[PDB]
Amino acid sequence: SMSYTWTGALITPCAAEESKLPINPLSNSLLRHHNMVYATTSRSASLRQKKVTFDRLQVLDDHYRDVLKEMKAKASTVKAKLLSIEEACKLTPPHSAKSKFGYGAKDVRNLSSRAVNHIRSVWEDLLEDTETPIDTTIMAKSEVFCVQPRKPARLIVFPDLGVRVCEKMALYDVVSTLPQAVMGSSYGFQYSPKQRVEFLVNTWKSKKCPMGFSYDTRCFDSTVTESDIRVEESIYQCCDLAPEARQAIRSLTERLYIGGPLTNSKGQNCGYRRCRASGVLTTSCGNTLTCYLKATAACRAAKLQDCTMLVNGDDLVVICESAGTQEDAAALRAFTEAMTRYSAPPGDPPQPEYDLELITSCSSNVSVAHDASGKRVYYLTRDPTTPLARAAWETARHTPINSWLGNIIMYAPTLWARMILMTHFFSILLAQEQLEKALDCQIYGACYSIEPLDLPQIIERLHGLSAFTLHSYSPGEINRVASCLRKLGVPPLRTWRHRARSVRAKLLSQGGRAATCGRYLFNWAVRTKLKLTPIPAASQLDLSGWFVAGYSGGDIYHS
Ligand SMILES: O=C(O)c1ccc(Cl)cc1NS(=O)(=O)c1cc(Cl)c(Cl)cc1Cl
Ligand SMILES: O=C(O)c1ccc(Cl)cc1NS(=O)(=O)c1cc(Cl)c(Cl)cc1Cl
Ligand SMILES: [Mn+2]
Ligand SMILES: [Mn+2]
Q1: How far apart are the CA of 362 and the centre of ligand 3, in A?
Q2: Residue 181 and residue 75 in contact, taking contact as beta carbons nearer than 8 Å
Q3: Which residues surround ligand 1 with Cβ inside 6 Å?
Q4: Per its Swiss-Prot or TrEMBL record, what regulates the activity?
Q5: Which of 333, 402, 441, 518 is most buried when burial is the number of CB atoms within 10 A of its CB?
Q6: DSSP string covering 472-499, please?
Q7: 331 vs 215, 305, 350, 507, CA distance in Å?
């Protein structure tokens, strides 16, 4: 069937849309080529619509069925619990889109009478009505990028707030626990960056002659068929579930997940969806299971040897045993035709790689540096272009989520996050005297409230002390960073070192947590290094829950 059907009504914005980077003194000190940074808007919606609208092709074979049964056998060991309305409400982000039924996220979090009453009625409706399609709103997502030698806005589809809370009650525990039970070490969201690196490195070293590749499906959500979504439900149904949760899951699958009507911000009928909605609770878990299922079966069909998968939603990395240059090339090609038959055609043909550093997944790749002892240490890095463009944007404009904070945490060991992001943002926080102000950021899609002054302990707990002593980065990594800065008009690293020494000094002079930030985060900036000892507060942090599952598009808030 067609992934989408359109009436002609336009995808409209519900407020003014900014697309250009402002000329701001704070942002200009970080990035001078402001005309190269832009934000997507509804103006490009039609372009995206054209790309994601097509008829799907899907042929399932014995390998697919074999793997599905293997996954279901594992899912059968799961017992999922039903979340109370209170628990579900508390998972709702403070700035989540308000309901059209007289209440907003703040009301939900406060368990106000009207919000809770409506949520209950929505729940009872899911238990009683097993067929009526649930309405969804379609919007053009606002994301920041750097012009390329422009990307049309992505389309987000989500149901009302009441429905979103009900999804949590019925499925939060399932999407938080089932993926790991089914996919084991292949489920990527169970890993912190260091652990992801650990898995990739060990998986690579375990092969006699490793060969690996990233497989990028063209607009994955649009490739997801009704069959895929019902197969996904069949996996969830293997869990021990409360009667109402089982019905809610059955109803949500038929009324929302497999598809439904699309309404624009103006309340006009835009069309119909018959594929994955980006803004529902099951998107991350469902895409991961779907991608893992198809690729695991595809490997068998293509005869790839010892395929080890690492899946994060639609992002897939495969590491296997090489059978020779020509053999691998033909097998990868066969893999692609198998995935194509399963309705997971590639955006760009995958290419076999024989060096782990050359494998890129969602712009990220593993690289190596050295600690104080001179020992090799692998870490996760990525092209800094988008992180820098977004940092500049969030510097000049107030945004609900601070990607820069999430990037500092996830890429703390990188040359660019340390020299640029830490330097730039701490200097600004110092100047505005807002170091102790908690900010919101996202990790694997879930929203977290974080205090900048706790970054030292956070980073130590997640990356280890070596994150504050890495040096001697690879030539390729250094070159990528340097060339990126020239492209964006970002001052050279020598300038950032100078700024860091001054920022470091100021932080030390204030003592307390601030001083700790200066000592640990900016030790790289001084010749006479300071003895960095394990931070007491670090070993006392409760980061249990940060890396359990993916929740992108799931409207999740962890407090
Ligand atoms: O060339 C390097 O030094 C290098 C640095 C980082 C990475 Cl990710 C790969 C590299 N090359 S590689 O041949 O794929 C490689 C992979 C692993 Cl798993 C280990 Cl233990 C050592 C090397 Cl040599
Ligand atoms: O070598 C160190 O002691 C060191 C350790 C970590 C970091 Cl983030 C930077 C370090 N050196 S630095 O002087 O700041 C520096 C490094 C590079 Cl690669 C480049 Cl192009 C330019 C500069 Cl100005
Ligand atoms: Mn993805
Ligand atoms: Mn190498």
Answers
A1: 6
A2: yes
A3: 201, 204-205, 355-357, 366-368, 378
A4: Activity is up-regulated by PRK2/PKN2-mediated phosphorylation.
A5: 518
A6: ---HHHHHHHHHHHHHHTPPPHHHHHHH
A7: 13, 9, 11, 56
Record the tokens describing residue 534, joined without a space. Answer: 């394990």
Ligand nearest to the CA of 473: 2
Cα separation, 80 vs 82, in Å, equals 7
Nearest to 312 by CA among 160, 199, 390: 199
Closest to 164 in 3D by CA, of 91, 107, 231: 91
User: Separation of 478 CA from ligand 2 center, angstroms?
Assistant: 10
- Our CA angle for 142, 458, 94, nearest 5°, is 40
Which residues are paired to 379 by β-bridges? 367
Burial classification of residue 348, based on how many CB atoms lie within 10 Å of its CB (0-12 exposed, 13-18 middle, 19 or more buried): exposed
- Helix, strand, coil shares, percent, the chain, to 5: 50, 15, 35
State the amino acid at position 213 in one-letter form: F
SS3 242: coil
Give the burial class of 226: count Cβ atoms within 10 A of its Cβ; 0-12 exposed, 13-18 middle, 19 or more buried: middle
**CB neighbourhood size of 148 (10 A):** 8
Q: Cβ(134)–Cβ(161) under 8 Å?
A: no
Strand partners, 4: 273
**Residues 6+ away with beta carbon under 8 Å from 31:** 21, 37, 388, 389, 391, 392, 488, 489, 490
How many Cα atoms within 13 Å fall on the side-chain side of residue 278?
16
For atom 13 of ligand 1, the residue with the nearest CA is 355
Residue 533 is encoded by which pair of tokens? 């000892």
How far apart are the C-alpha atoms of 553 and 432, rounded to whole Å? 32
Residues with CB under 6 A from ligand 2: 415, 418-419, 470-471, 473, 478, 493-494, 497, 524-525
Residue whose CB lies within 8 A of the most ligand 2 atoms, among 368, 415, 469, for a mutation test: 415
Domain boundaries, the chain: 1-361, 362-559
Residues in the chain: 559
Gap between the Cα atoms of 365 and 197, Å rounded? 9
Distance 376 CA to ligand 1 centre (A): 10
Q: How many CB atoms lie within 10 A of CB 265?
A: 17
Report the alpha-carbon distance of residue 476 to residue 164 in Å, rounded.
Answer: 44
- CA 241, chain centre distance (Å): 28
- Do the beta carbons of residue 367 and residue 379 sit within 8 Å? yes
Please give the span between the terminal C-alpha atoms of the chain, in angstroms, as a whole number. 41
Residues lining ligand 3 (ion), CB within 5 A?
313-315
Q: Is 66 known as a binding-site position?
A: no
Of 357, 359, 364, 380, the residue with max ligand 1 atoms within 8 A of its CB, to mutate for a pocket test, comes to 357
Give the closest ligand to the alpha carbon of residue 200: 1
Residues near ligand 4 ion, CB 5 Å cutoff: 355
